[PDB]
Amino acid sequence: TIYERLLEIKQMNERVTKEINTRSTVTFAKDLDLLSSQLSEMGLDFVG
Amino acid sequence: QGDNGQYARQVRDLEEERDLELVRLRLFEEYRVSRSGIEFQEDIEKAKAEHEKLIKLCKERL
Amino acid sequence: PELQVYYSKIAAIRDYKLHRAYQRQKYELSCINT
Amino acid sequence: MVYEATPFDPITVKPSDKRRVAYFYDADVGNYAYGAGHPMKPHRIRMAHSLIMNYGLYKKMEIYRAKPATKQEMCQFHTDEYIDFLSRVTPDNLEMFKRESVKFNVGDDCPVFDGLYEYCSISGGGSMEGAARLNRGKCDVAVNYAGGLHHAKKSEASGFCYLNDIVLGIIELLRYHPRVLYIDIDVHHGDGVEEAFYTTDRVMTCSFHKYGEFFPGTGELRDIGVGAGKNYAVNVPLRDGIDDATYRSVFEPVIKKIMEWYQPSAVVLQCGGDSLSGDRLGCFNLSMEGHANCVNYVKSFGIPMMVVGGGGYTMRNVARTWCFETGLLNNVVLDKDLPYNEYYEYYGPDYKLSVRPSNMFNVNTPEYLDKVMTNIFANLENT
Amino acid sequence: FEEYTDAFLRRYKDHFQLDVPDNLTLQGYLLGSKLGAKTYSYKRNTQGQHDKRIHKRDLANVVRRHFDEHSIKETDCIPQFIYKVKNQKK
Ligand SMILES: [Zn+2]
Structure with missing residues (x-):
């Protein structure tokens, strides 16, 4: 079970890392500050 | 060639509708520009008031 | 000292809020035109 | 075995082909509220239209306003007493209309709200004008997001739909076409249009709905038609959480077979927004791109098509998929x-x-x- | 007789050959504001143009006066009315 659970994310990590890298916030959403930086506050974002 | 009386009258009515719609659009655009302006001015007023109130409260606590 | 740095930081956040308001006004005007 | 799952290919459109589309929007459509706690929300049409304005799509599409449908035009399907009561009723005098409301199945699950006739007439006029412009051949696509309410029966307003403008649009298309294929994507079964066109050959009321414990309670694989309309009622009941890949693998074979055999001249494609993830009542899990792949496949053939709105109990997702479909058109x-x-x-x-x-x-x-x-x-x- | 429509008054004026300009539509009437005077229709329908239009009230009053002034005789019209009723299908 552990092996299959880890494989189900290892098989698509190749495209997930590309999706995370290519992510770009729209210029006019940060003004509304709905983009909660709590993940950014704790470093939980996967960017970089 | 468009010289028909009834067709010309209907064309005039349609052009009147078009011109009233263009007038109403301009009036509404100006009104809601004014609404955005007054909202923005009120936002600045509230921001400055809260800034000054926070400064005064900090001075009082200190 | 502490008062000066507090005033500077509060002024910085106030300036950021004012810039955000100006940006929102600019976006609203662009929406108006479009 | 006929179904065959395939990977979801990227969106591709022919650049050589040119398509004329006549978007229909009545600015007063999104101003009637069903109630405080009612899932139905007509605001989505207005938000979607605002999105299409902001995206810059107006520079490549045509948009007009459809004249409201007259009472006689609206009576092409529904009974005289039904439309008469629907016009005469107001949220303030139902005490004297209690018996009529009980008979007409209105008030409890579908309540009376001011401007009901205005909304119904707007939707009917949008559908009728779209069909009329389709017949004249000026525009290949007649998008009418306002209507699409296909749950209205001949003498009863069930499923939050008081008037079924899809029937009127199909009628005005049939006045100049022998066979028009109707496609449903709403999660609920299209009970109204199905019942209206269950005993005729001149239509192909294809559907893609879900079978279970619901309000419609119809849409079985057994129902195929009566009289000359036998085997002319295609139903594809489904179940919870059908994803994008399998929905595409179900849709594309069936539509290809229909176009190869039925050979219609026009398509009345429903585009209900309640078949998406995060819906209020819809149990499906289709994404917006999956919701638009069906429309792109229908469009790829190159025949006149009338896209309509319909259900959709959420606002943001419905507006997003509607503007994406309009752009893809x-x-x-x-x-x-x-x-x-x-x-x-x-x-x-x-x-x-x-x-x-x-x-x-x-x-x-x-x-x-x-x-x-x-x-x-x-x-x-x-x- | 202002309760009638524009089509009735226009056809009345055409039939009786009255020399009264066509009435301005209600929307056309409301068009004429300060900024509404800069539109094409108002700038081309106010001064120096033979296509000038006038309000609906005055045309309605003129038509009412002409209709009440126009006397009738039953022998001339009742048979004509019956013929028109029995002819409308053709
Ligand atoms: Zn639905």
Whole structure:
């Protein structure tokens, strides 16, 4: 079970890392500050 | 060639509708520009008031 | 000292809020035109 | 075995082909409220229209306003007493109309709200004018997002739909076409249009709905038609959480077979927004791109098509998929950014042109899909 | 007789060959504001143009006066009315 659970994310990590890298916030959403930086506050974002 | 009386009258009515719609659009655009302006001015007023109130409260606590 | 740095930081956040308001006004005007 | 799962190919549109589209919008459509706690919300049409204005799609599409449908035009389907009561009723005098409301199935699950006749007439006029412009051949696509309410019966208003403008649009298309194929995507079964066109050959009321414990309670694989309309009622009941890939693998074979055998001249494609993830009542898990792949496939043939709105109990996702479909209708792909509008703060915390699927139990086993495809092909070869 | 429509008054004026300009539509009437005077229709329908239009009230009053002034005789019209009723199908 552990092996299959880890494989189900290892098989698509190749495209997930590309999706995370290519992510770009729209210029006019940060003004509304709905983009909660709590993940950014704790470093939980996967960017970089 | 468009010289028909009834067709010309209907064309005039349609052009009147078009011109009233263009007038109403301009009036509404100006009104809601004014609404955005007054909202923005009120936002600045509230921001400055809260800034000054926070400064005064900090001075009082200190 | 502490008062000066507090005033500077509060002024910085106030300036950021004012810039955000100006940006929102600019976006609203662009929406108006479009 | 007929169903065959395939990977989801990227969106591709022919650049050589040119398509004329006449978007229909009545600015007063989004101003009637069903009630405080009612899932139905007509605001979505206005938000979607604002999105299409902001995306710059107006430079490549035609848009007009459809004149409201007259009472006699609206009576082409419904009974005289039904329309008479619907006009005469107001939220303030139902005490003297209690018996009529009880008879007409209105008030309890579908309540009376001011402007009801105005909304019904707007939707009917949109559908009728779209069909009329389709007949004249000026525009290949007649988008009428306002209407699409296909749950209205001949003498009863069930499922939050008081008037069924799809029937009137199909009628005005049939006045100059022998066979028009109707496609449903709403999760609920299209009970109204199905019952209206259950005993005729001149239409192909194809559907893609879900069978279970619901309000319609229809849409079985057994129902195929009566009289000359036998085997002319294609139903594809499904189950919880059908994803994008399997929905595409179900849709594309069936539509290809219908176009190869039925050979219609016009398509009345329903585009209900309640078949998406995060819906209020819809149990499906289809994403927006999956919701638009069906429309792109229908458009790829190159025949006149009348796109209509319909259900959709959420606002942001429905508006996003509607504007994406409108953009795809122009052979133009819309970027993921949702440019600022008066109703920008509605569009969730992501603020991207996308609706994302949730994790739901995909009860749609491949065996069920194979069985339903085999049944549909067997009942379709008779055409 | 202002309760009638524009089509009735226009056809009345055409039939009786009255020399009264066509009435301005209600929307056309409301068009004429300060900024509404800069549109094409108002700038081309106010001064120096033979296509000038006038309000609906005055045309309605003129038509009412002409209709009450126009006397009738039953022998001339009742048979004509019956013939028109029995002819409308053709
Ligand atoms: Zn539905």
